Amino acid sequence: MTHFSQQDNFSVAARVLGALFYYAPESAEAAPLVAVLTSDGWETQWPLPEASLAPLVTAFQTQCEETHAQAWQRLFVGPWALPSPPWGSVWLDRESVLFGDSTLALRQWMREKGIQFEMKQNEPEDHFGSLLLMAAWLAENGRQTECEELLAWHLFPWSTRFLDVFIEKAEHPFYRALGELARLTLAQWQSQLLIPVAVKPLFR
Ligand SMILES: [Cl-]
Numbered sequence: 001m002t003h004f005s006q007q008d009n010f011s012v013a014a015r016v017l018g019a020l021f022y023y024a025p026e027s028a029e030a031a032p033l034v035a036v037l038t039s040d041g042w043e044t045q046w047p048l049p050e051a052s053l054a055p056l057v058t059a060f061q062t063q064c065e066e067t068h069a070q071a072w073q074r075l076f077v078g079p080w081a082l083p084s085p086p087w088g089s090v091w092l093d094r095e096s097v098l099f100g101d102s103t104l105a106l107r108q109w110m111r112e113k114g115i116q117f118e119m120k121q122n123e124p125e126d127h128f129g130s131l132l133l134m135a136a137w138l139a140e141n142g143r144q145t146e147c148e149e150l151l152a153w154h155l156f157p158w159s160t161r162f163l164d165v166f167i168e169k170a171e172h173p174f175y176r177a178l179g180e181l182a183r184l185t186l187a188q189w190q191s192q193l194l195i196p197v198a199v200k201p202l203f204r
């Protein structure tokens, strides 16, 4: 009878994933979490079976010529095209623009729920990382229904496709393993929804 968002380390997992997608690995926000995932022990706390996490433990700790900072810059910043853009409207808007039609639906939904959760200046609300941070924060506030709506309606319709391509093209053991951790985790949560996941055609 307890909602999935209020148990099994939901908000901790959502925050760790959200922060590592949204913040550079050498930042104050993400560095402590890179430390955690590159250390032994995390797999015993993560809300997924240890046997499933075993290959990810090794991968997070694989040394690599390219630094975490360089990989994150390349995957999430630039200067070149991102291998798997982390904003929903790229996948959901027929034209794949930022601040697209799905981004407005998200904004309208947040306004409707009285949600104020502001992130980077000039950036859209539908970044994968900030959606997980917002959902984590909603869960911490006990707002299980809105947490579930956010996931069902504004993240899950496109997040599987984004992670598929992200994992395929990550090209760094740490971010590949991160994508895989996120894919397993989000799929677990999706299986626990009490409302139907939204279903949308994808354009990338
Ligand atoms: Cl490290």
Ligand SMILES: [Cl-]
Residues within 6 Å of the ligand: 099, 100, 101, 104
């Ligand atoms: Cl629009």
Ligand SMILES: [Cl-]
Residues within 6 Å of the ligand: 142, 143, 144, 145, 146
């Ligand atoms: Cl509620």
